[PDB]
């Protein structure tokens, strides 16, 4: 009864960072060996657990967040980070446990004319709470006059699309990011290693 990490790390279509995808992993044996067995993963990185100790402990209520961001925005997926996606798209808590798997996906998430399926939030009056999602596509009012739902000046659409193209440099090429969260809790531990 292996955990469905293959679907998470092998899905054809990831989610946009403003509407990042959430999956609950529980009641299954998880072999994190396959995760590291992926050669191309450019960021197998984390803070509060040793990478070799993943298979040596049993957790409960594992969470997987999948999305796609720029190359230079990967550094914002970390505790205590400020930026665009960290403040308005995906806020990791300061006391985060679990960790982040980022790999280049220019071969898949990029089109010659530009891939406009991936999007991020640019405007928000206040920062996101940790692990909070916002999908409200309401005309952002950056000014006094209420335009009442029509775009224009001082009224902008809060979501902007990445123009992923295959000739972009490393830093603006698409990157697939999966954040695993190991939330220990007072319950029978479910997700154990081999």
């Amino acid at each position: 009864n292996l955990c469905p990490f293959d679907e998470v790390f092998n899905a054809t279509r990831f989610a946009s960072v403003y509407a990042w995808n959430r999956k609950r992993i529980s009641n299954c044996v998880a072999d994190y060996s396959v995760l590291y067995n992926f050669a191309p993963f450019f960021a197998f990185k984390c803070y509060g657990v040793s990478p070799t100790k993943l298979n040596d402990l049993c957790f409960t209520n594992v969470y997987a967040d999948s999305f796609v961001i720029r190359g230079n925005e990967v550094s914002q997926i970390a505790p205590g980070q400020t930026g665009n996606i960290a403040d308005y798209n995906y806020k990791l808590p300061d006391d985060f446990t679990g960790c982040v798997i980022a790999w280049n996906s220019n071969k898949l998430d990029s089109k010659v004319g530009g891939n406009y399926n991936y999007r991020y939030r640019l405007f928000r009056k206040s920062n996101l709470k940790p692990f909070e999602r916002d999908i409200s596509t309401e005309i952002y009012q950056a000014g006094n006059k209420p335009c009442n739902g029509v775009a224009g000046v001082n009224c902008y659409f809060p979501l902007q699309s990445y123009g992923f193209r295959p000739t972009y440099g490393v830093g603006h090429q698409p990157y697939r990011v999966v954040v695993l969260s190991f939330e220990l809790l007072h319950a029978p531990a479910t997700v154990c290693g081999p």
Epitope: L122, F123, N154, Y168, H172
Partner: antibody
């Protein structure tokens, strides 16, 4: 959109000063607000930025001794410069980033008139 | 640390002719480049967004093209009030890296 400046003058090196930017027709807290300085005779240089959510960033030359803030009550942007050195003599502009009708993301579409700051003994 | 240069440093032009000024980046920046115009004693005004998009209220004689490492600002009929300094600014590097170009000066030729 109007952005009215205030607070310029002449100071001794190692001094301090506060610059004010009073906006109209827009909200300072709801926009990306930048301070951009230009030395007399040289080109434009980005100094500081404050996000709508309150996050701030600074260029490397002014790290530590420059801070940016906002007052929501009367919709103003503030720049407090401390430990001023001679390289800070310039005209400072309050600019709104990522605006304009076609939504020029990353670009400054509305500018103030700028205040003059001089740092010499 | 995206070095950004403008060519030429200053050119002299007449009234009504087409003029092109080029902006070159140390590395490809996609289309994250903007063209500003600043008259003496005044604040800069944003002319071209995203290296190709005309801003609202800007006369149609201003046009922008290019991508990657080379960008160009072209004026078709250089009016007598179009004599100013033109800057190219990139928004590609990082929130702490919005460097500006050197600037190109356009003046009357006699």
């Amino acid at each position: 959109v109007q952005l009215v400046e205030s607070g310029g003058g002449l100071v001794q090196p190692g001094g301090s000063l506060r610059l004010s930017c009073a906006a109209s027709e827009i909200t300072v807290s709801s926009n990306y607000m930048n301070w951009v300085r230009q030395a007399p005779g040289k080109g434009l240089e980005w100094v500081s930025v404050v996000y709508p959510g309150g996050s701030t960033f600074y260029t490397d030359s002014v790290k530590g001794r420059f801070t940016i803030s906002r007052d929501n009550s009367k919709n103003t942007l503030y720049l407090q410069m401390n430990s001023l050195r001679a390289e800070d003599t310039a005209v400072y502009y309050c600019a709104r980033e990522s605006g304009g009708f076609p939504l020029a993301e990353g670009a400054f579409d509305i500018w103030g008139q700028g205040t003059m700051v001089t740092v010499s003994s | 640390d995206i070095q950004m240069t403008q060519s030429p440093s200053s050119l002299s032009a007449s009234v009504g002719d087409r003029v092109s000024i080029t902006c070159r980046a140390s590395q490809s920046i996609s289309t994250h480049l903007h063209w500003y115009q600043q008259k003496p004693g005044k604040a800069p005004k944003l002319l071209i967004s995203a290296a190709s998009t005309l801003q609202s209220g800007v006369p149609s004689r201003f046009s922008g093209s290019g991508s990657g490492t080379d960008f160009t600002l072209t004026i078709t009929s250089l009016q007598p009030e179009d004599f100013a300094t033109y800057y190219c600014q990139q928004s590609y590097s990082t929130p702490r890296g919005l460097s500006f170009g050197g600037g190109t000066k356009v003046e009357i030729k006699r």
